[PDB]
Amino acid sequence: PKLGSSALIAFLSLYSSLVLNYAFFAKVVELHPFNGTGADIFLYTMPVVLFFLSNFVFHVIALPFVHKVLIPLILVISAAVSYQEIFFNIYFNKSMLNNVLQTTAAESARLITPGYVLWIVCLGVLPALAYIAVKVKYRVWYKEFLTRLVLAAVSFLCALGIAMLQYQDYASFFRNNKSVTHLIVPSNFIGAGVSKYKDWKRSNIPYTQLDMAVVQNRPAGSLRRFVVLVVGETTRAANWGLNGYSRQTTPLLAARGDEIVNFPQVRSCGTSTAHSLPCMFSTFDRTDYDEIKAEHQDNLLDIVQRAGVEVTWLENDSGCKGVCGKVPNTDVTSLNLPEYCRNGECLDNILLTKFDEVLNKNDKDAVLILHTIGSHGPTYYERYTEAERKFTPTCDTNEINKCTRATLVNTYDNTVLYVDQFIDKVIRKLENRDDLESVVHYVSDHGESLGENGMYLHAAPYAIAPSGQTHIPMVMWFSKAFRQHGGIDFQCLKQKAAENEYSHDHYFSTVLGLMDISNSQTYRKEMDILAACRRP
Ligand SMILES: CCCCCCCCCCCCO[C@@H]1O[C@H](CO)[C@@H](O[C@H]2O[C@H](CO)[C@@H](O)[C@H](O)[C@H]2O)[C@H](O)[C@H]1O
Numbered sequence: 023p024k025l026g027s028s029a030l031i032a033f034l035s036l037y038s039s040l041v042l043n044y045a046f047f048a049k050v051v052e053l054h055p056f057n058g059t060g061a062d063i064f065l066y067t068m069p070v071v072l073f074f075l076s077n078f079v080f081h082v083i084a085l086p087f088v089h090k091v092l093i094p095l096i097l098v099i100s101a102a103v104s105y106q107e108i109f110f111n112i113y114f115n116k117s118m119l120n121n122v123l124q125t126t127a128a129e130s131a132r133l134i135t136p137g138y139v140l141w142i143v144c145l146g147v148l149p150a151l152a153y154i155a156v157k158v159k160y161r162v163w164y165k166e167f168l169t170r171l172v173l174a175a176v177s178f179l180c181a182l183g184i185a186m187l188q189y190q191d192y193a194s195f196f197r198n199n200k201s202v203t204h205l206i207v208p209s210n211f212i213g214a215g216v217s218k219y220k221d222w223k224r225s226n227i228p229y230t231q232l233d234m235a236v237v238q239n240r241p242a243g244s245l246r247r248f249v250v251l252v253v254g255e256t257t258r259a260a261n262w263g264l265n266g267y268s269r270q271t272t273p274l275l276a277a278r279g280d281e282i283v284n285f286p287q288v289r290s291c292g293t294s295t296a297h298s299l300p301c302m303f304s305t306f307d308r309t310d311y312d313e314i315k316a317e318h319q320d321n322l323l324d325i326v327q328r329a330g331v332e333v334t335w336l337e338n339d340s341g342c343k344g345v346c347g348k349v350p351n352t353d354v355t356s357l358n359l360p361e362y363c364r365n366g367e368c369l370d371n372i373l374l375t376k377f378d379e380v381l382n383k384n385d386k387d388a389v390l391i392l393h394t395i396g397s398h399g400p401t402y403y404e405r406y407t408e409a410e411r412k413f414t415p416t417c418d419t420n421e422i423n424k425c426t427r428a429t430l431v432n433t434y435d436n437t438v439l440y441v442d443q444f445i446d447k448v449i450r451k452l453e454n455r456d457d458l459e460s461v462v463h464y465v466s467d468h469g470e471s472l473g474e475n476g477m478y479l480h481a482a483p484y485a486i487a488p489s490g491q492t493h494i495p496m497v498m499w500f501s502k503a504f505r506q507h508g509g510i511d512f513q514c515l516k517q518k519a520a521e522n523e524y525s526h527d528h529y530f531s532t533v534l535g536l537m538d539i540s541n542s543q544t545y546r547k548e549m550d551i552l553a554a555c556r557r558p
């Protein structure tokens with residue numbers, strides 16, 4: 023092989039800080055543009071700072087002879103991360119690790135493209151091999167030890183000096199742009215990794231149950247009450263026909279006119295599925311939401327099931343993120359019906375094949391959840407059939423960043439056309455059931471980025487997330503028997519829907535109010551969207 027001293031680590035640091043991390047320096051030049059006023063030293067020196075800082079932590083990490091394993095891993099992962107940071111504009115924070123950790127083979131394989139593989143292999147696996155090849159000439163364990171600790175420390179001070187010489191620039195820039203740090207590799211996922219490790223240990227707590235005395239309190243002589251909750255995926259409000267978008271992407275629901283209540287101002291709990299799902303079914307408002315406490319207490323379905331309601335969850339995304347484990351549920355995607363399914367994913371209309379079994383399961387009030395794959399990208403083109411391919415040209419690849427933005431928007435507007443007909447078909451299975459007080463409720467889990475300022479997919483840090491990812495659609499439909507006997511004032515409801523802001527925080531108590539449930543301590547009347555319009 024080749025023989026280096028270290029040295030080997032200055033090269034490693036030259037690479038990591040100067041080759042990868044393009045996304046990081048790209049973001050700061052965007053946030054802090056050149057102009058010539060000599061304040062650009064803040065930009066020029068900045069790679070130098072990161073070099074020194076990388077030299078520092080790599081002297082501490084590159085220990086013999088675990089480093090021959092640990093460094094290639096870091097180089098290979100930095101490549102895998104920097105690629106999507108550079109082209110998709112993602113951040114690698116703790117939540118992004120929860121994505122990676124909660125994913126599936128079908129779901130993540132769609133992310134692979136030849137350029138991605140080529141990137142990883144040329145910027146990750148290769149430098150890894152080059153590194154592993156090098157035989158390192160250690161000095162005497164005392165002479166070697168001293169040489170490491172002095173370099174590691176002068177590096178830090180060199181970085182601290184260069185920054186301290188420019189303290190107000192650093193202080194300003196990073197107090198305003200606190201998340202830009204989740205762009206730096208590898209502090210990135212290491213930081214997220216220990217932060218998740220800390221969460222792992224702090225997770226030994228017991229299981230709290232909530233609302234143990236809940237019961238239904240439906241009047242005597244009441245029709246069965248059947249509620250369907252359609253959980254969307256990735257569909258955003260800005261491309262939703264009912265919300266006034268240039269294209270009627272919801273023509274079937276627009277056609278139903280007034281019987282469909284549309285909410286033009288609703289925001290999500292999170293901007294990823296792993297975050298939004300568990301949160302919206304938990305008691306925690308977005309700003310109180312704790313991942314760990316939520317995982318270890320009863321959620322909405324647990325409580326609603328305790329009250330005697332029949333809860334079924336049919337799944338067609340990558341899983342229910344832990345929300346459905348204690349209620350009857352089905353992985354509909356695994357039926358692999360060639361009419362709907364290819365490559366381990368399915369068109370949402372497959373869910374409708376199992377709908378009637380649930381509807382005729384028994385004769386007590388029910389909550390049925392249809393968890394859909396919706397507008398899930400990057401393979402948006404799989405989210406609809408030819409019948410809904412109304413806007414063209416389309417982006418028929420997972421390489422969504424090489425499509426033109428208009429071509430991508432087209433493809434994504436076709437996914438909504440499929441969302442729209444899915445909801446419509448659910449309503450059709452119910453609207454003629456005169457013996458049934460039925461409600462169909464739809465909301466998405468989060469929106470999506472469609473290439474704006476260079477950002478694709480979703481999962482952005484909420485605090486800096488764009489409207490596209492947080493502003494989501496929501497509609498409600500009520501069957502004829504519900505409108506006769508459900509006690510709701512429908513014109514009141516239309517007005518509230520038009521005038522008020524809502525969010526996922528209204529989900530929990532809205533669903534509980536639809537089941538007429540007594541003795542509930544978790545129910546909050548002021549978070550039930552219909553309470554204000556319920557009579558008497
Ligand atoms: C293990 C140490 C960290 C290195 C792990 C390797 C990561 C390499 C870069 C991957 C980061 C980008 O890849 C990321 O993958 C996950 C799941 O596939 C996607 O996330 C997808 O699944 C998760 C979980 O079901 C959902 O919360 C999310 O809504 C959905 O987008 C991200 O949208 C995508 O951006």
Ligand SMILES: CCCCCCCCO[C@@H]1[C@@H](O)[C@H](O)[C@@H](CO)O[C@H]1O
Binds near residue numbers: 203208210217
């Ligand atoms: C090699 C350059 C190091 C720069 C370090 C920047 C500050 C540390 O940034 C960490 C992140 O790395 C970490 O992912 C999250 C986890 O919650 O918390 C931040 O404080």
